[PDB]
Structure 1
Amino acid sequence: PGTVDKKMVEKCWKLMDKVVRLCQNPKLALKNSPPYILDLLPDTYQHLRTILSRYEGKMETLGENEYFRVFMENLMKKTKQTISLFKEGKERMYEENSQPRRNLTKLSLIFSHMLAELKGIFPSGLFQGDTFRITKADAAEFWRKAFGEKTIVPWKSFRQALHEVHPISSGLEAMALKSTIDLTCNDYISVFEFDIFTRLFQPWSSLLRNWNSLAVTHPGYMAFLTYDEVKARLQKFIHKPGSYIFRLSCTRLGQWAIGYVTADGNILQTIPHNKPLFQALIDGFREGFYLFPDGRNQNPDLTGLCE
């Protein structure tokens, strides 16, 4: 990760504008719903302009910060990816079912995550990474013992430190995990990505079992969806009361949301109330609300995850 200066920021800014102009092609018909790249990139620009404003006169201090160097490096790469995606994709960028368009959708989520991370670490344009409050006490004590006040660590270091407390059984399991926790796809784990992951897959004591049971082996899991997409997905099961799905929100990272079909033909969305998601799923099945994940007749029994 190389030192950042004004020239690099100006470079990234021009690359972001070209991605914007590419995404303004009317042949794209980009949906006005999150993640919305036409807002995210201008918002990333405006937040970077704010950070620089805070560090005017101490620009040497901002440019050596490890988190910031890794971030700008990743921002440049992801914009170059997107430009190249349009170049290689040609007319297929305008068929939604295409590999290129699906990859644009993936990159729009990544830009959303990067902006949320950057605002988490630079709340008002000031670096606060070394004082980031990790939400779950057990997870916070893990990060402090292993990494102290560090804001970001290489993936290999994170994997090694995690393995000591939660063994990772195989390189296969390791790459599946990295895919879930490395939200910004930069081969680092920030304290922010760690906070999100451990909020989603609490309690810490069974972290990887929670993650496998919810993100890998559960057919009701839908990854990132909007509110509207939850309704559209359940619409085919509108007359099967008890059909349900659960999903992530790119506007509220670290939060789970649930959608379910009522007995009277309505789709409602809710969150787990003061309890891990798997407990809400266990309770919802027993109470007759969450019976058929994505409409399916068989439902994972998460009861084994309780202690």
Structure 2
Amino acid sequence: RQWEEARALGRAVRMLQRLEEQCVDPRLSVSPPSLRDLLPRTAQLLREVAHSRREAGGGGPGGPGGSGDFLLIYLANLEAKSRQVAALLPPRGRRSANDELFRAGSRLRRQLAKLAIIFSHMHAELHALFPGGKYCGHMYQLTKAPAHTFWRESCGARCVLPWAEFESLLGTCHPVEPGCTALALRTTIDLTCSGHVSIFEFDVFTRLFQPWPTLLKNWQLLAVNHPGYMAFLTYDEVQERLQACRDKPGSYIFRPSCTRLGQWAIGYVSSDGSILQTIPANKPLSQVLLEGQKDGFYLYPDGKTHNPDLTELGAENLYFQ
């Protein structure tokens, strides 16, 4: 067994090249995430992976959760996702279509941004686990130590896990309420919508919802139950959303940055009525919103009046840091 993976990688690369052709419409995109930057970016990185592994004693061990297993799943998913984009914006292209695909607020536009985000996340994961094509998943270090401790004691050297096993493991540390809560969490953690959670995906989430002792609490209070939290939005979408709230200076919404993974992008309307977006480093989100509230910048989630009191959570988070 030497050539299956190579064929897989080649199949993917060709498909990315073919999909790049279908993204012929000018209105794409071009602000990050842009499928048009991402596709050839991801293609070349795949070539490097292909090439780095012709000549490989590596990387790492090769049971489930190793590099070979990771790629099997990763490529399968990339292909799946590519088909969805194929179906959305055919054909070669042909003319200039579809007009709805680029109306702010439209459904297709959202379907497209969500796919564009998935591609950004798919590339980010590969770049993190195979920098320059060279696998480091057996050595990768999570940013928050307690997260790191967890991942290595639970998962060992593995870089990737099926959702079910991951949930079970996370559960024995922070209990995950079954049903709609467990589903919401899965949707938040599984950035690639692959059915598996990578050491990278986990790095993103544990950074976003630090500190560790309140991991799920933060996710629950600041994402699931906060009206200012906007799951999986692009920058341009934020700009579009807040257009209505330009009346109410102090209106704000937040989401994960797409280009600085692990970090938040707060979007607020200024005094002037200008829509500004800022990425804070590197505080918990509870600290970020409290200070922005206390300074008059972050007052009205989604342009609405009910701003959850986070006083206790913020205090709790400083205590645990």
The TM-score, its normalising length taken from structure 1, stands at 0.88
Contact kept? 1:15, 1:80, Cα under 8 Å: no
- 1:151 & 1:218 partners in 2: Cα distance? 31
Shift of 1:227: 4.7
Residue among 98, 102, 118 paired with 2:110? 102
Give the secondary-structure state (helix, strand or coil) at the position aligned to 1:124: helix
Corresponding residue number in structure 2 for 1:140: 148
Contact kept? 1:92, 1:98, Cα under 8 Å: no
Question: Aligned pair in 2 of structure 1 residues 108, 303: CA closer, same or farther (>3 Å)?
Answer: same
Residue among 246, 249, 252 paired with 1:244? 252
Q: Does 1:70 align with 2:90?
A: no
- 2:84 & 2:245 partners in 1: Cα distance? 38
Corresponding residue number in structure 2 for 1:36: 34
Q: Does 1:79 align with 2:77?
A: no
Question: Aligned pair in 2 of structure 1 residues 272, 100: CA closer, same or farther (>3 Å)?
Answer: closer
| Segment drifting more, 120-129 vs 190-199 | 120-129
Paired amino acid for 2:82 = T
Q: Does 1:116 align with 2:124?
A: yes
Contact kept? 1:18, 1:83, Cα under 8 Å: no
- 1:229 & 1:99 partners in 2: Cα distance? 12
Runs of 5+ in structure 1 lacking a partner?
none
Contact kept? 2:13, 2:47, Cα under 8 Å: no
- 1:288 & 1:102 partners in 2: Cα distance? 31
| Segment drifting more, 191-200 vs 70-79 | 70-79
Corresponding residue number in structure 2 for 1:150: 158
Give the secondary-structure state (helix, strand or coil) at the position aligned to 1:95: helix
Paired amino acid for 1:74 = N
Shift of 1:171: 2.1
Shift of 1:129: 0.5
Contact kept? 1:36, 1:108, Cα under 8 Å: yes
Contact kept? 1:35, 1:112, Cα under 8 Å: yes
- 1:266 & 1:78 partners in 2: Cα distance? 36
Residue among 230, 237, 253 paired with 1:222? 230
| Segment drifting more, 122-131 vs 227-236 | 227-236
The TM-score, its normalising length taken from structure 2, stands at 0.84
Contact kept? 2:13, 2:46, Cα under 8 Å: no
Shift of 1:229: 4.5
Question: Aligned pair in 2 of structure 1 residues 140, 79: CA closer, same or farther (>3 Å)?
Answer: same
Q: Does 1:10 align with 2:10?
A: yes
Question: Aligned pair in 2 of structure 1 residues 59, 38: CA closer, same or farther (>3 Å)?
Answer: farther
Richer in helix (by share): 1
| Segment drifting more, 256-265 vs 203-212 | 256-265
Contact kept? 1:239, 1:265, Cα under 8 Å: yes
Runs of 5+ in structure 2 lacking a partner?
317-321
